[PDB]
DNA sequence: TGTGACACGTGCCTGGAGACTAGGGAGTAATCCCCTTGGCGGTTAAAACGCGGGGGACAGCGCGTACGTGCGTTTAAGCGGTGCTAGAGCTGTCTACGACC
DNA sequence: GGTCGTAGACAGCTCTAGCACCGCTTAAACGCACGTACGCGCTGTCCCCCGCGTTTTAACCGCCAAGGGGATTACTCCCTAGTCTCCAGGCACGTGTCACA
């Protein structure tokens, strides 16, 4: 329930780096959902890899290996 | 420059991990790398949606553009 | 189950190959697999192009549609 | 013009297999160019694999590995 | 293990001075190690794919040569 | 001429990368030597381009910005 | 964008200085001008990248020299 | 070659500022590039046995440069 | 076990969250026309279907042959510190310099 | 061609991060020997690949009538970005608690 931590100005600035000129008012919810899906995928892959690595935590290299499979 | 504030992103990552599987530890380096990758992915997605919007004879990006870019890239 | 005529596709593949290296033979199964792959690739590209066209309130597909589909597909 | 064997109705059949309902005139030329690029890449990879294996013909494995390189 | 650090700092300094560089920043070493790992991963992936195509178990010189040819 | 990277660490790194890709793979010594020469030549060329970029910027000390610029120009 | 008349004049001049008794059609010069546009926009983007890397906005001859030297010329 | 065309190309390429000698250098590099591409096209035409350089000759020259 | 890695209470600027508003642009539609596409009829220019030679894929058999591993050890080279300083990021200017007709 | 706002090298200017200098260490490597499993062809075989040859399928060409795209433009009209004002974090700063080979 903390996905709202991705504030409207954050999404607006992220689109601003992407060359976007104007943003509709419904982009924010869709972008929050897309971020939830992408972080779920990456976190699940990293967690699976780090359980396969016989560790109870997750490291930066675990995330790098998870992203390499994206 | 990171455009997502560190604390809310950390809270979101920890919440996602807790919902998926409790008793997991995240450190600053892993969260920073994940946030950088997430920001790069979102910038790429928004570039693609801007391309779609410009193709649609439009400048304001609407969720139609987001869904189009996601489904063409194969993520959906 | 194939949409491109087999013999002209054989001719085109052999033309490209002889442009690459001369006096190269082709297994019939190799050409068949290559044609199936090309058909699948174009079917996917046309699916994405139709998606772009219906997104832009259009039915007719235009070279802009294929260019956009390739551009946001990574090609 | 050895690529004209990929005829206009062939591209129409491919598009209608892809769900397209109406096709503009320049789509045929654009699709012909796109397929020429794709075939050039895949055949280049396949002939490179064949040269690596010291053979004078391209077999199914060479094409499969070329498509694997292309990401199919 | 984290064996990319096995590329010693003096080795990178010698490689740079071979290219004519007169001063090396401290952050050059990590970026160079990352770039070298990326290039080596690409070339090794190509060589492994070529070896798998040849139905072999040992990556010979031909596989590495063809991997280099395929990339630049 | 003579190699600049120590042989054994590079052999171990190459074998580790291969194990990451395909396990239980044997390497011919000539193949590893060719990989060593290729990596040395690539790094020498990259550092030459980086030095050119840095000297253009009125500075001698090359910085990761120079390497990034050289890689972007070369298409990497 | 490049006008077709000066481009045709330049290609005719370079053909005269390289191999005379040669004729170019509209499609050939159109392809040449498209290639020219792509090459020049790429070169200018590379020189601009060098310029921002150089803490300057003007694209002097030095940026052209860099983009030519690094790319393989 | 005209200065305004070079300016349009630079603007399309993301250029914000333009120097003085850059026009002459651009003309020179364009002449060299055209010399190379025409040499490749002539070589292919001599290999392809044609009277005049065609569009497919140009495409082949670019793709096998 | 010693050394290392997280969690909770604060002040404050900083960024985000309520509205207000004036435009910029999204959306729907009426022609419209006209400009393509689709579809249909006739036709022909091909593709798809049967024999031959032999080029080379493919299988079996080695056989030196080179990889993996397994030491002895020792010295060139790497890693910790310092000593020292040319060099990088940051200022003011004036001729050199690029934008508007 | 002209007339009007900006700036790159020079000179400091200061801190600094990098180049030696050096002691201590250490593992790369040169050598030696071994097991053996895979590379590299040898040799033989025959699969099918290329090259020629007759018939429906279909691709081209052309014409005609429906349709839909680009465009203008009414035509409101929706609602986003800029602005204004008010309210929730964020990094140091501590103080305390849990993990690992």
């Amino acid at each position: 329930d903390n996905i709202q931590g991705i504030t409207k100005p954050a999404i607006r600035r992220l689109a601003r780096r992407g060359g976007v000129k104007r943003i509709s008012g419904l982009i924010y919810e869709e972008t929050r959902g897309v971020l939830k899906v992408f972080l779920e995928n990456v976190i699940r892959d990293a967690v699976t890899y780090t359980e396969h690595a016989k560790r109870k935590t997750v490291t930066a290299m675990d995330v790098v290996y998870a992203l390499k499979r994206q | 420059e990171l455009l997502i504030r560190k604390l809310p992103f950390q809270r979101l990552v920890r919440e996602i991990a807790q919902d998926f599987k409790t008793d997991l530890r995240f450190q600053s380096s892993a969260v920073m790398a994940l946030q950088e990758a997430c920001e790069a992915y979102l910038v790429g997605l928004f570039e693609d949606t801007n391309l779609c919007a410009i193709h649609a004879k439009r400048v304001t990006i609407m969720p139609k553009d987001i869904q189009l870019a996601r489904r063409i890239r194969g993520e959906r």
Side-chain angles (χ1 to χ4, degrees), chain A, chain B:
Chain A
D1 46 354
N2 64 7
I3 187 51
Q4 282 103 11
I6 309 299
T7 56
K8 274 168 35 66
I11 302 172
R12 287 177 62 190
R13 275 186 323 278
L14 280 162
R16 251 52 171 202
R17 194 194 336 286
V20 184
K21 280 144 195 273
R22 286 178 36 118
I23 299 164
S24 161
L26 294 174
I27 301 299
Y28 309 128
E29 281 66 11
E30 192 81 11
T31 304
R32 285 167 186 158
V34 169
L35 292 180
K36 201 169 195 286
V37 173
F38 177 73
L39 282 71
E40 271 184 359
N41 281 343
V42 174
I43 282 172
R44 278 195 297 189
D45 284 353
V47 163
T48 286
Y49 172 61
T50 195
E51 311 315 280
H52 187 277
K54 310 174 189 178
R55 289 200 291 274
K56 283 186 179 177
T57 71
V58 65
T59 42
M61 291 315 78
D62 291 331
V63 176
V64 176
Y65 282 101
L67 297 154
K68 198 70 63 64
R69 265 72 189 160
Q70 281 285 288
Chain B
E1 167 184 355
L2 277 299
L3 295 178
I4 311 167
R5 320 303 312 182
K6 267 148 83 181
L7 183 57
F9 195 84
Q10 277 201 36
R11 291 181 304 132
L12 161 70
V13 165
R14 292 190 211 287
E15 176 146 283
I16 285 172
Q18 182 87 10
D19 281 359
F20 168 69
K21 174 179 176 178
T22 69
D23 303 309
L24 291 179
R25 182 79 267 166
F26 281 71
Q27 83 273 27
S28 82
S29 65
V31 166
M32 204 293 277
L34 172 56
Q35 171 171 136
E36 265 200 354
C38 169
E39 281 200 357
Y41 158 70
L42 209 54
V43 167
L45 162 70
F46 270 132
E47 279 166 340
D48 293 343
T49 60
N50 179 48
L51 294 174
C52 298
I54 301 299
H55 155 79
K57 264 192 241 183
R58 216 169 60 236
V59 65
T60 285
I61 286 181
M62 281 160 65
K64 305 157 58 177
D65 289 302
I66 305 282
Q67 293 168 359
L68 177 69
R70 274 190 72 213
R71 185 201 311 300
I72 289 189
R73 278 146 64 101
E75 181 216 330
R76 177 77 269 175

